[PDB]
Design an enzyme around this catalytic site. Structure first.
Site, PDB file in Angstrom:
ATOM      1  CG  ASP A 160      -5.084  36.903  27.835  1.00 55.75           C
ATOM      2  OD1 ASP A 160      -5.954  37.142  28.702  1.00 55.75           O
ATOM      3  OD2 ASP A 160      -3.859  36.951  28.079  1.00 55.75           O
TER       4      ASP A 160
ATOM      5  CG  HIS B 252     -19.955  25.530  11.262  1.00 54.39           C
ATOM      6  ND1 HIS B 252     -19.836  25.475  12.634  1.00 54.39           N
ATOM      7  CD2 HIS B 252     -18.692  25.520  10.776  1.00 54.39           C
ATOM      8  CE1 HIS B 252     -18.557  25.436  12.962  1.00 54.39           C
ATOM      9  NE2 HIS B 252     -17.842  25.459  11.853  1.00 54.39           N
TER      10      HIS B 252
END
Ligand SMILES: CC(=O)c1cccc(O)c1
Length: 425
Positions: free
Chosen positions: A372, A153
């Site tokens: 997807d 991060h």
């Protein structure tokens, strides 16, 4: 379950990228030193090329062209400030196989068993030794596949991380980039000179528990139906008292946790709420801003009051804490952090979210199920394992039923009552 790696490789940007040192703002420094874990699960679609690794890596390289800091390495400047050396060394891509099935994870409660689906990192060899992003595609003994993600991060927060993954999946389906990333964190530079305006209660020591046993922490996940959420929302009418579904749910969880933990009537509790500064910072950050912009609202309360008063009482405290985090408050935070001698010391740990306190974040807004890669959306996604008690994740449904899930880490003896209280709607 045993897992073993067929291959691991460094995937670099498919084309040339800027050779620069990316400056980090104070928000990009108040972060953990490890990689933040997250996991995607996919069911077989019947395709013969289900999660073709060549397709995945090809698209990965293409995405890393615009998201080039992701393929970089951590370095420190002359002052010892962590920055990102955008050297295009590449991200880690691991292909692995499992002798188990997707069904073995059941309701996908984020226990530490999920960590095995994510590449481990040796943090003992310098901060410059490892990739900022580690990826593992694991093929299970049912045809199912998990995508494990470990993201440092220092690169960016989960919002930008999700931006990257969805872009990757888009390109995997042949799509061009929809939202190009903006890469310049100097927009979150502190004022010169730094002029803090509030004492910033967010960084003050949390309420303590007089004592402290050892604690057997367990992880669970609970589904709430659309009707249950609707019923909870109209409880704002109770006691002649509108707060949002999110405010009411977070308040509900906060309240249930206190009652489940058997907190004394007088015991103080502090709630830590992840909130996105992108919505409130002025002037508005450019779309696709690549970095850390996550702050924390920290409402205080008395356990006896939370339990004896309606949920909207908890929701009101949550609403108030979030409402005061405008541009000025966030700007003050940058200035306050700037004056701090050690930013890593401000990073919250197990101690912060121990009983009687709690940390909560809601991922419902995120398109967390838009990943997807051509063979279907994920059947589930959530944090890649929770280590300590007192963390909760609100996950939206993959389906359109409007339901959600509350994943949370509590003590084993507290978890059983929490489930009872959560459904008392
Ligand atoms: C990641 C998460 O759940 C959380 C909750 C509260 C505070 C914080 O910094 C993080």
């Amino acid at each position: 379950m045993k897992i073993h790696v067929r291959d691991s490789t460094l995937v670099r940007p498919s084309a040339a990228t800027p050779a620069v040192s990316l400056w980090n703002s104070n928000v990009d420094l108040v972060v953990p030193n490890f990689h933040t874990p997250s996991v995607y699960f996919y069911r077989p679609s019947g395709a013969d090329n289900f999660f073709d690794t060549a397709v995945m890596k090809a698209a990965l390289g293409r995405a890393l062209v615009s998201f080039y800091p992701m393929a970089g390495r951590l370095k420190r400047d002359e002052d010892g400030r962590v920055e990102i050396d955008c050297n295009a060394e590449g991200v880690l891509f691991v292909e692995a196989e499992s002798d188990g099935t997707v069904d073995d994870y059941g309701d996908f409660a984020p226990s530490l068993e999920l960590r095995r689906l994510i590449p481990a990192v040796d943090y003992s060899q310098g901060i410059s030794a490892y990739p900022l992003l580690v990826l593992q595609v694991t093929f299970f003994k049912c045809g199912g596949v998990s995508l494990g993600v470990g993201m440092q991060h220092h690169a960016a927060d989960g919002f930008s991380g999700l931006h990257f993954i969805n872009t990757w999946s888009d390109m995997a389906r042949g799509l061009d980039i929809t939202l190009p990333p903006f890469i310049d964190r100097t927009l979150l530079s502190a004022r010169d000179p730094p002029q803090p305006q509030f004492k910033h209660v967010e960084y003050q020591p949390p309420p303590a528990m007089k004592t402290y046993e050892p604690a057997e922490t367990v992880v669970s996940i609970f589904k709430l139906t659309k009707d249950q959420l609707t019923t909870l929302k109209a409880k704002s009418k109770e006691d002649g008292n509108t707060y949002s579904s999110y405010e009411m749910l977070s308040g509900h969880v906060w309240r249930c946790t206190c009652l489940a933990r058997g907190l004394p009537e007088e015991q103080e509790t502090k709630l830590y709420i992840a909130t996105d500064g992108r919505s409130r910072l002025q002037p508005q950050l450019p779309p696709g801003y690549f970095g850390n912009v996550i702050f924390t609202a920290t409402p205080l309360a008395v356990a006896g009051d939370l339990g004896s008063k309606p949920v909207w009482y908890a929701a009101s405290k949550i609403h108030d804490a979030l409402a005061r985090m405008d541009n000025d408050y966030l700007r003050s935070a940058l200035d306050f952090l700037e004056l701090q001698p050690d930013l890593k010391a401000l990073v919250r740990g197990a101690h912060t979210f121990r009983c009687p306190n709690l940390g909560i974040t809601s991922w419902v807004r995120l398109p967390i199920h838009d990943a997807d890669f051509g063979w279907g959306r994920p059947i589930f996604m959530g944090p890649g394992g929770i280590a300590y008690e007192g963390l909760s994740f609100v996950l939206p449904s993959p389906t359109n039923d409007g339901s959600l899930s509350v994943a949370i880490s509590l003590q084993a003896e507290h978890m059983k009552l929490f489930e009872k209280l959560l459904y008392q709607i």
